């Protein structure tokens, strides 16, 4: 159904392709040309996962594992039950993610708002793309992508991390991790100000932007502002997604030794006395 104010916004137009052929709503969802492709690709990938689970012998969501082909198969296609099903789902997954981002462009174009949300999602897609196709292409085999399992894809992270003998010493991992722990810190503090100002102690008037602006001035000596926090909050999250893509694309295509050995440039500088 609609909302109390939704009717005045559901106008015709704003599509990127297909016009009014697909321009309608199914329930609350908006269907576009890319909503049709999203439905096809997502459903095809979902069914193929359970088809592979049926042949795997288990339907347990923890134990379902669709794995890439061996490194021997290279960049070519593999038998469906020997790693080819994973490749098809990857094509479906990429098609469903790109369509989802393009569908968001149509929605935000129909509402006359900015395209920040689809652009931010593209960084998430870029991180997924650099894990499943970009990095395997550089390393020369489709078997370097992570498997499609709830707990299996943690084993891929564990072994890939320990393939460089200490993955905490990765300079890009060091930067990327700093962005998660800070984005969550920024999210916690930003969400606290709005909640604290809008929900004061019982019997007290609600607070305006000035009161929360002066709180952090009293608290940490500097306040970034109502607009600045969202502006810097997106940048912290986008940098987190980007630098996480960097830490994994340089592990194997750019660096093959252990990651602690990378810091040997700093230890053995000519300036340091012997």
């Amino acid at each position: 159904a609609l909302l109390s104010f939704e009717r005045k916004y559901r106008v015709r137009g704003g599509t990127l392709i297909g016009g009014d052929l697909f321009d309608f709503w199914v329930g609350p969802f908006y269907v576009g040309f890319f909503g049709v492709t999203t439905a096809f690709f997502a459903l095809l990938g979902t069914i193929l996962i359970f088809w592979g689970a049926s042949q795997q012998g288990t339907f347990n969501p923890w134990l379902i594992n669709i794995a890439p082909p061996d490194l021997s198969y290279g960049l070519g296609m593999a038998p469906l039950m020997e790693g080819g099903l994973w490749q098809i789902i990857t094509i479906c997954a990429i098609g469903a993610f790109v369509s989802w981002a393009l569908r968001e462009v149509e929605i935000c174009r129909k509402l006359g708002m900015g395209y920040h949300v689809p652009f931010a999602f593209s960084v998430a897609i870029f991180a997924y793309v650099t894990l499943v196709v970009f990095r395997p292409l550089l390393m020369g085999a489709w078997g370097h992508g992570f498997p499609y399992g709830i707990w299996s894809h943690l084993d891929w992270v564990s072994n890939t991390g320990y393939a460089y003998l200490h993955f905490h010493y990765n300079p890009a991992h060091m930067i990327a991790v700093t962005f998660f722990f800070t984005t969550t810190l920024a999210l916690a503090l930003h969400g606290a100000l709005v909640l604290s100002a809008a929900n004061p102690p019982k019997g007290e008037e609600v607070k305006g932007p000035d009161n929360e602006d002066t709180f952090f001035r009293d608290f940490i000596g500097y306040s970034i502002g109502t607009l600045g926090i969202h502006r810097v909050g997106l940048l912290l999250a986008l940098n987190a997604g980007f630098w996480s893509a960097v830490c994994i694309i340089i592990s194997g295509p750019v660096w093959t030794k252990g990651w602690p050995e990378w810091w040997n440039w700093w230890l053995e500088m000519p300036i340091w006395p012997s």
Binding site: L63, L71, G114, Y115, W151, L185, A197, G228
Partner: protein, 325 residues
């Protein structure tokens, strides 16, 4: 193209804003010294306003510096007061926790005794800062959401260094005070107790850590998308819903079938961030006290994947083949 609100195209600077005041007399503890930085004003507010210094702020800063000095000056003494070697090994030095042989007793100064004294001052400094956050919210007549959220972070901070060492009965279970060393502790902690990936609370805490970055990217971009409708003025949109809140809600309703309000988004934002250390704190507490091996726990509870392929490299290639000879 259309102007994306990522950098302000023009900045206006007037008299410094000294902040609001009430009968609590906030101004008598304020520094009243302000400075304006234009470089940071391209992305946020350009005023480095006065800071409220009370007693919880002063106590935390003084005790925090003592912890900083004791850890730092021990590191300088470790390399024999060699400043060039202190800089070179700065990321590698630390103040190691006490040896396991001393249990919960006070160890010698050179073998973790200064670690306990330094950790005592850090504990005072962190708790004092929490009290300052709680006191400031009370004096501003605002909600205590900042203090409660910060208390969630302290919960993991307390568990990681205070609560768990007491339960194991050894001060040696604390985290060393080093840049690289507390990364070494993190890796060694996972290896010692099985595989921390299979800790359900570590998995759950990652869900809320990913969700936190997920949701703040979603919220940060949505507000910037509706900032053309005055969407950055979130507080006024709660009290009087404008077109900015409607379009932001309708964008997500048409995308994923449901949305939030301008206030309710910050309840989602608050809870995912707060649940990140709360769940992790429980996972670290159960590690060592209860389980002692997480992968074997996973095998027992039947959520550890099983593999049927071979393991050696001889089952996939040859040494000569890999070398191309």
């Amino acid at each position: 193209p259309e102007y994306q609100n990522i950098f302000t195209q023009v900045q206006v600077q007037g008299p410094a804003e000294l902040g609001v005041d009430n009968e609590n007399n906030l101004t008598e503890e304020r520094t009243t010294g302000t400075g304006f930085s234009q470089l940071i004003g391209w992305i946020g507010n350009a005023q480095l306003g006065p800071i409220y210094l009370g007693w919880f702020g002063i106590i935390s800063l003084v005790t925090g510096t003592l912890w900083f000095n004791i850890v730092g000056f021990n590191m300088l003494s470790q390399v024999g007061y060699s400043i060039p070697e202190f800089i070179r090994q700065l990321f590698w030095l630390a103040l190691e926790p006490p040896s396991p042989e001393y249990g919960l007793r006070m160890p010698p100064l050179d073998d973790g005794g200064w670690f306990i004294i330094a950790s005592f001052f850090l504990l005072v400094s962190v708790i004092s800062w929490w009290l300052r956050s709680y006191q400031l919210a009370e004096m501003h007549k605002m909600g205590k959401h900042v203090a409660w959220a910060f208390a969630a972070a302290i919960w993991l901070f307390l568990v990681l260094g205070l609560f768990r060492p007491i339960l194991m009965g050894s001060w040696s279970e604390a985290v060393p005070y080093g840049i690289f060393p507390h990364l070494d502790w993190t890796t060694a902690f996972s290896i010692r107790y099985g595989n921390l990936y299979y800790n359900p609370f570590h998995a759950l805490s990652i869900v809320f850590l990913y969700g936190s970055v997920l949701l703040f990217a979603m919220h940060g971009a949505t507000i910037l998308a509706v900032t053309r409708f005055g969407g950055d003025r979130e507080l006024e949109q709660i009290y009087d819903r404008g077109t900015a809140s409607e379009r932001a809600g309708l964008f997500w309703r048409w995308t994923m079938g449901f949305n939030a309000t301008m206030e309710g988004i910050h309840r989602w934002a608050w809870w995912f961030a707060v649940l990140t250390p709360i769940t992790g704190g429980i996972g670290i507490l159960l590690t060592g006290t209860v389980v002692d091996n997480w992968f074997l726990w996973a095998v027992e509870h039947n959520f550890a994947p099983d593999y049927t392929q071979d393991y050696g490299y001889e089952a996939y290639t040859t040494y000569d083949g890999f070398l191309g000879r």
